[PDB]
Structure formats: C-alpha cells, structure tokens
C-alpha cells in the first residue's frame, strides 16, 4: 500500500461536501487516491 | 497607593458595560449652543398632499 496523500484527499472530499463525520468514512473508501517535429534551421 | 491598595472591591462581579458606561451627570450634559430654535417652526413640507 502506497499510503495516502491526505492533502488532495481531504480537498477532493469537501468538493461535494462531507461536513458531518460519519458520512466522511464512506467517501474515504470510494475516493481512494495515491524540438519541433520539423523546422527550418539556418 | 491606589494601585497598591485595592478599591473596596464590591466591583469584583461586574461586567465591562457597567463600569465603563455609568449614568452621566446631569450637569455634564452638553447644551446645543449653535443650533436653530424650534419656537420658530422649521421649514416642513407644509403640502401634506
């Protein structure tokens, strides 16, 4: 397990709104996050 | 000696509203020296329409 970021995790949850505590555990699990091609010259 | 010896300290239980805002003296009230006298009535919209 690559641990958790916990910064975008809490940021990404509060986008929809996870104010109350007991609802935040449900969104804790489901939001699991860890030259030019041709040119001239000269 | 006023801050060495405390006051009689009946003001232990009193809020900042009571101490800072007492009843002002009746003689410290300001007279309105530069104002318009009302015994000549002020210009009011006499049209009541």
């Amino acid at each position: 397990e690559l641990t958790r970021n916990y910064i975008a995790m809490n940021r990404g949850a509060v986008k929809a709104g996870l104010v109350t505590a007991r609802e935040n555990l449900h969104y804790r699990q489901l939001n699991d996050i860890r030259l030019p091609p041709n040119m001239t010259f000269g | 000696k006023q801050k060495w010896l405390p006051p009689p300290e009946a003001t232990l239980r009193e809020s900042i509203y009571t101490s800072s805002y007492p009843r002002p003296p009746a003689g410290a009230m300001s007279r309105r020296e530069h104002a318009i006298p009302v015994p000549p009535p002020r210009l009011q919209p006499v049209p009541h329409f």
């Binding site: 916990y6 | 239980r13 809020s15 900042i16």
Partner: protein, 426 residues
C-alpha cells in the same frame, strides 16, 4: 438560552463530575441544598446553561450520572454536594465491566444505554436551544471507555447538530494503572474520532507534573487532579455563563480550532497556576498569563508541542482589563516561537474574553491546543496495543463477550490512519 447537558460516565467521570459540579456551583453561587446564597446578579443570569430549576430557588444540575457498578454513584450521593443531583438522573446497573471495553460497549452496557438515553432525552427536550451534550470519561476502563462511546454514538444519531464535547483522560505515557488499558483505549478512539465535535486529551501524568513543577505540592490528591480538569471545563463554557467583550461559545471555538474534519483532539491548559508560598510574589498581569498558558510544562496532556506544530490555538481569557495587552502578547507568541505554528494557516490563535474573573484570581486563561504532537499519544497507545495483540494477550476476555479479532485490527487501522493523517498536516 443555550444549555449544556452533562454526561459523567465511569468512576473517573463520576469523580471529575463531583468537582466540576462543585466548581460550577461556586461560579454561579449555588449551595449544596440547591438555593442561591450568592451576591452579584450576573451569577443567576445564565444558570440555565449548567442548571435547571424546580420548586422555589432549587437548581437541580442538568447531569445524567452513569456507572455500571452502583458503588461510585453511591459515594457521590452521600458526599458534600450530592443532595443537589436529581435521584432519578443517577443511572447505574448492578454488575460492572471489569476493565473490559467489550462488556461496556457490547454486553452489560447496551442493556443500560436504553435507560441512560431516556434521561438524556428528558433533560435535552426539557430545554430549548441546546448548545450540545458533554461527556467526562477515562478511555482505559469499561463504562467510561465503552458505555461512554456507546452513548457518544447513540446521542449523535438522534441529536446530530448539538456539539458533542468530551473530556477524556487518555492512558498516561508511563504511569500505568489498568494493565488491559492499551486495548480499551485503542478500541475506544475509532469511536472518539468520528462521534465527537471536540474531544480533549487530559492524561493524568501531565496533571501530576503541573501539581509538582508548577504548583509545588508535596502530596497531590485526585481532587487536585480533578480540580485542574474542572477549572479547564468551566473556562471553555465561560462566555456562555458570564458577560464578555469578545464572546466565544463551544461552537465558535471548534469552528476556529478544528482545521480539517477528522482531527479533533485538543490539549487543554490553565493559566493562573502558582504555588501557595509563591502566591503573593507574582504580579498577575496579561504578560504573566500567556507565558504559562503556552509553556509546555503547563500543557495538561503528555505530548510536548515543541515536538510538533500547533495547527490552531485558543485562549478563553477570563478577567477585566484585557483588550490590547491580550492581542499584542498573542501575536508576539506566534512571532517568536514561529516553527511551532503551521504556515498553511496565517493567524493561528482564537482570542476570547469573559469580563467576570474566577473567584479569588484577578485574571485566568484556558488554552485549547490542536498540536500535531497529539500524534504521539496515539503512537504509544498503538506501540503497546500491537505488542499484546501479537501474542494474543487477554484477547480471550474480549473475544468472548462478543468481538471478532478483525475489530481489533480495524481499530489499529483507524488509529494508525489518524497519526499519518496528522503527520501530513505537519
């Protein structure tokens, strides 16, 4: 008219309540019988918060006392201020928990929650705007660790807006009283991390240190320890009971002290704590009040904040003259000690003021602090829990009453999470 219902659970909570209800009985001026033989009028103005009213001037405290065995409640009834509590708000069973969170949270405990929930309903509905409930326990027992959290859960299910404040006496670092305390605690945090809006960690070890290094006291008793918890239980609800310049209730303190959701463990601490022979030698000025309420030796918890970084700080100052020295000496701190204050949050201190001084003292202050140093508390609790679950010690007791071993691991999870969740915000 906001009111705070008290919920003392477990021997430890019934001894923290004995003192709190005696401390709040002086602040307002209520004698044992229940009448008001006080002086000022700002003492019976906000009695509604921690006091109901009956015949004449009786003020029966709004408290539902809880204990699995009927011995600790009995001591209270037959004590100095025991004829003040309503005999019916004393909910006790017959058997106990035997230091077993299992029993308290699953067996003998869910057989009492019904009667305790009935009274917390007859003392909550019997009031209008309820600031919120409030619990005093000792994570490290059975009633206080289990029933305590069983109640803390079934009260947030019915009243899910009121402020669930809890004053938990977390297991001490070294001082060990109960041997199966690692488990009880490790299994009682997963609940206090998602069913409280403001939990306080008041370890008993820190308490002894403030009654030894600061308040030079040869023989500290549990009453002195309890006094230091009650004093810091009356300052957080002080601007709700007495007039103030910058008021601050129990929500206007969470709002500005709980950074992100989960994190909600706070380290309390008093301010005007001096000795007895050194009481008349120290001028009680605002400078000489912040110096102590931020010094680590005063922290009423065992997680020196130096090792961490305060995510927020509060200061429910109580006293009169205090409106320029307060702020000037509150920005000063955030400026000198500048590494013990996170940067992702500009201002970090919530100042408040109650113009009514604690009887005797001219000025006091209470510091609720959310350092990421509380991540140590859980760390030790886990290092110890993990040491016993490995060689399955005592598990038999817990697994028997009714508890899979998965629950235990799930607990170590929630905890280890909080520690890492904290570490990141640091």
């Amino acid at each position: 008219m906001r009111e705070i219902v008290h919920l003392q659970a477990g021997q430890c909570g019934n001894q923290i309540g004995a003192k709190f209800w005696e401390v709040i009985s002086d602040e307002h001026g209520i004698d044992p019988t229940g009448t008001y033989h006080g002086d000022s009028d700002l003492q019976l103005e906000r009695i509604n918060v921690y006091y109901n009213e009956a015949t004449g001037g009786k003020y029966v405290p709004r408290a539902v006392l809880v204990d699995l065995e009927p011995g600790t409640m009995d001591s209270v009834r037959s004590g100095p201020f025991g004829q003040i509590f309503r005999p019916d708000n004393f909910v006790f069973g017959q058997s106990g928990a035997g230091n077993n969170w299992a029993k308290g949270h699953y067996t003998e405990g869910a057989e009492l929650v019904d009667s305790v929930l009935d009274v917390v309903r007859k003392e909550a509905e019997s009031c209008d705007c309820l600031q919120g409930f409030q619990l005093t326990h000792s994570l490290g027992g059975g009633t206080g660790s289990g029933m305590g959290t069983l109640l803390i859960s079934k009260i947030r299910e019915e009243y899910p807006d009121r402020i669930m404040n809890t004053f938990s006496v977390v297991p001490s670092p070294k001082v060990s009283d109960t041997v199966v305390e690692p488990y009880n605690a490790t299994l009682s945090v997963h609940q206090l991390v998602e069913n409280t809006d403001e939990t306080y960690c008041i370890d008993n070890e820190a308490l002894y240190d403030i009654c030894f290094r600061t308040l030079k006291l040869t023989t500290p008793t549990y009453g002195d320890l309890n006094h230091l918890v009650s004093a810091t239980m009356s300052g957080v609800t002080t601007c709700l009971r007495f007039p103030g310049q910058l008021n601050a209730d129990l929500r206007k303190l969470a709002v500005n002290m709980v950074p992100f959701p989960r994190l909600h463990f706070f380290m309390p601490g008093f301010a005007p704590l001096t000795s007895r022979g050194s009481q008349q030698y120290r001028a009680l000025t605002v400078p000489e009040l912040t110096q102590q309420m931020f010094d680590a030796k005063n922290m009423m918890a065992a997680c020196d904040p130096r090792h961490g970084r305060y995510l927020t700080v509060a200061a429910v100052f109580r006293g009169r003259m205090s409106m320029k020295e307060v702020d000037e000496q509150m920005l000063n701190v955030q400026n000198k000690n500048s590494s013990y204050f996170v940067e992702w949050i500009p201002n970090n201190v919530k100042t408040a003021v109650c113009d009514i001084p604690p009887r005797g003292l001219k000025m006091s202050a209470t510091f609720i602090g959310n350092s990421t140093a509380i991540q140590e508390l859980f760390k030790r609790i886990s290092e110890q829990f993990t040491a016993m679950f490995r060689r399955k010690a005592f598990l038999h007791w817990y697994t028997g009453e009714g508890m899979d071993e998965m629950e235990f691991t799930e607990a170590e999870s929630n905890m280890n999470d909080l520690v890492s969740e904290y570490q990141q915000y640091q």
